[PDB]
Amino acid sequence: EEGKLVIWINGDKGYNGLAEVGKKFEKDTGIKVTVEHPDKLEEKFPQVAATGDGPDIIFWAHDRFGGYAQSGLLAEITPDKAFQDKLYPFTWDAVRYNGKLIAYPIAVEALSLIYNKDLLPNPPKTWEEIPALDKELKAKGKSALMFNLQEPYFTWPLIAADGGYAFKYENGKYDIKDVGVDNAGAKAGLTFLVDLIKNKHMNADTDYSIAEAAFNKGETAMTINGPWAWSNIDTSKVNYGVTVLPTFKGQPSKPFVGVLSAGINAASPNKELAKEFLENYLLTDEGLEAVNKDKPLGAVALKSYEEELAKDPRIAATMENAQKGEIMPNIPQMSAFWYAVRTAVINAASGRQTVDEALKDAQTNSGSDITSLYKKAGFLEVLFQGPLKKEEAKREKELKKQQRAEEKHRKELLRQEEKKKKELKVEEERQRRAELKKQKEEEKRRKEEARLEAKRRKEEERLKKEEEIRLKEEA
Numbered sequence: 001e002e003g004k005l006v007i008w009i010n011g012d013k014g015y016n017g018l019a020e021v022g023k024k025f026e027k028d029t030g031i032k033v034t035v036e037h038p039d040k041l042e043e044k045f046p047q048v049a050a051t052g053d054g055p056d057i058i059f060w061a062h063d064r065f066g067g068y069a070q071s072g073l074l075a076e077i078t079p080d081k082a083f084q085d086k087l088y089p090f091t092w093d094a095v096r097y098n099g100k101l102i103a104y105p106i107a108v109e110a111l112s113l114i115y116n117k118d119l120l121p122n123p124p125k126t127w128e129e130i131p132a133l134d135k136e137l138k139a140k141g142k143s144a145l146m147f148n149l150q151e152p153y154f155t156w157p158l159i160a161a162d163g164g165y166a167f168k169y170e171n172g173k174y175d176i177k178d179v180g181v182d183n184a185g186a187k188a189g190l191t192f193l194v195d196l197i198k199n200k201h202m203n204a205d206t207d208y209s210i211a212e213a214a215f216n217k218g219e220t221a222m223t224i225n226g227p228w229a230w231s232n233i234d235t236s237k238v239n240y241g242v243t244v245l246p247t248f249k250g251q252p253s254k255p256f257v258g259v260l261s262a263g264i265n266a267a268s269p270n271k272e273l274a275k276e277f278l279e280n281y282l283l284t285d286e287g288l289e290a291v292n293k294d295k296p297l298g299a300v301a302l303k304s305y306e307e308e309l310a311k312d313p314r315i316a317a318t319m320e321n322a323q324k325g326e327i328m329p330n331i332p333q334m335s336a337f338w339y340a341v342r343t344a345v346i347n348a349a350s351g352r353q354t355v356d357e358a359l360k361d362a363q364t365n366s367g368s369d370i371t372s373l374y375k376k377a378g379f380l381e382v383l384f385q386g387p388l389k390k391e392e393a394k395r396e397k398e399l400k401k402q403q404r405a406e407e408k409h410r411k412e413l414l415r416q417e418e419k420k421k422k423e424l425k426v427e428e429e430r431q432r433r434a435e436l437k438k439q440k441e442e443e444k445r446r447k448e449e450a451r452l453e454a455k456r457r458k459e460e461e462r463l464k465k466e467e468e469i470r471l472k473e474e475a
Contacts, residue, residue: 002269004032005277008045009059011037013260014294018282021290025281031273049073049265056268057278062094062103062261066330069097074263075271076100083279091301094259094327099172103261104278105301106288110322111157111226111255112314113246117239119221127158127192127248130222134201137221144201146215147224148208149193149349152341154224157245157253159189159341160326164254166337166366167329176333179366181341182359189248191355194348204349215240227298227318232402235409242314245321255321256328259301332370339373340365 007022009015015037022033036055038044042064048054050073068074079101084092091105115123119142124133134144148154156164163185168178180186196202215223216236224245233240245253262282264274281287288305291297299319300306310316328334344362347353353361381388 005034005057005270005273006055007033007035007057007059008041008055009035009037010041011039012295013037013059014291014297017291017294020294021282021287022277024287025277029273029276031270033277046071046073049267052267054265054267056265056270056274057262058265059106059260059262062105062259063328063330063334065095065103065261065263066097067332068263069100069102070332073266074102075266075268076102077104077264077275079104079275079279083283086283086303087301088303088306088323090257090323090327091259093169093172094257094330095261096172097330103263104283105259106262106283107260107297108299108301108319108322109226109258109260110299110318110325111154111224111245111253112242112317112321113222113244114215114225114229114233114240114242115222116215116218116220117241119218123222123241123243124246125244127161127246127253130246131196131199131201133221142218143214143220145222145224146202146206146211146220147222148206148211149197149202149204149345150207150342152338152345153256154208155193155345156341157224157255157325158193158248159186159345160254161248161251162186162188163251164189165326166334167331169327169329174329174331174333176331177367179337179363181337181344181363181366182356185251186359187355190345190348190359192248193345194355197349204346227296227314230314231406235406242317244317244324252324253321255325257322257325258328260297333366335370336368336373337366340368 005022005025007018009018015035019033019035022035025031026033041058042060045054045058046068049068050071065074074097087105088108091108092101095101095103095105113123119137120133124130130144137144152159160180163180163183165180167174167176168180169175197204211220211223212225212229212232214220216232216238218236218238230242245255247253262278264271264278268274282291283302285302285305285308288297288300288302292300292309298309299315299322300309306319310319329337340362343365344353344358348355348358
């Protein structure tokens with residue numbers, strides 16, 4: 001339908017703020033803007049867009065946007081050099097598929113180093129200081145660092161710090177035949193990761209839940225997580241800080257960068273209108289603020305608005321780690337990379353393979369046939385369909401108990417503050433009467449004290465003249 005903008009954005013984002021920016025776009029141009037949040041739009045959009053229908057604009061991470069363009073679902077955006085300068089240069093690389101821009105960057109997301117301020121006022125700036133910092137904290141019944149070691153997304157920051165990379169990115173493209181997994185840099189990064197486990201500084205069987213709980217309970221001093229986990233730490237009432245990830249051999253850690261992007265439908269009749277909306281209404285200070293006020297975006301690609309968000313050290317550390325991080329490729333071959341590195345880490349942490357053997361097979365399995373891997377996943381999904389469907393229900397059973405625990409926390413924080421605001425309001429009215437009665441009393445006691453001195457002088461002048469005439473009259 002030409003002449004009307006339809007926007008699809010996930011339900012966990014600030015869509016109400018996005019609708020307000022749409023109403024502002026409608027108040028100026030008269031074009032209706034309807035912001036919807038359908039369920040599972042990452043899988044529903046690729047089907048509706050292929051048949052012509054669908055939204056004019058769709059919001060989602062840039063990783064899925066790669067296959068969208070290969071399918072022909074996203075139109076090539078055309079921002080001028082002026083607007084390209086409004087966003088950080090590295091964010092455009094995440095929305096560039098096949099050398100052409102196919103999405104507008106909105107928000108930037110990357111892993112950071114979260115530390116307990118009560119245990120560590122000064123967090124370590126280097127990975128080499130953690131072994132000695134853990135030996136110190138082990139004497140006091142705690143540990144230094146505990147983060148997810150199962151998925152390679154959490155272990156890549158250390159593995160790629162010395163010179164690792166998924167696929168080499170050049171001229172705006174990706175070389176599936178050039179995987180940077182078994183080089184001298186990745187070998188040192190993974191060796192130091194394994195040496196941390198062999199020296200009993202980390203346990204190889206630590207996943208996401210084990211790490212999130214150990215930090216919330218105050219048992220470990222540090223953890224590695226993204227802005228999505230800040231809510232869970234706020235409920236634990238742990239004085240935590242979000243800082244830059246440690247360096248390894250002088251080089252900073254390289255976490256994968258995820259960019260929330262807004263793409264224009266390739267079959268949309270309102271491509272020019274979507275361009276006016278995204279560049280001149282959404283990607284502005286007033287626009288992004290309306291969305292961030294409804295649901296925080298974290299670090300955003302807009303420079304002018306990142307300055308104000310960067311006053312929050314947590315968002316400032318996320319953008320710093322993102323700029324030092326690695327743009328996550330949107331190439332479908334990435335699936336082979338995820339599976340290859342996953343087994344490379346697990347086999348190296350369990351002693352199945354050495355660091356050299358694990359990375360050697362990983363660089364080979366990264367170039368594995370993707371369709372063969374998909375069929376391999378289909379065979380295992382059916383083979384373990386029972387325990388898997390029970391695991392998914394258990395995670396949904398714990399997510400409802402973990403979102404009710406947050407609702408109970410903000411209910412507690414809203415109750416104590418609303419009661420403290422009325423409690424101080426009573427004291428302000430208490431001393432207001434206590435000082436009003438003190439003013440009425442002290443002002444009328446000093447006033448009468450002046451009448452005491454004036455009347456006493458009148459008495460002194462009257463008794464002295466009455467005595468004067470009483471002595472003058474001699475009998």
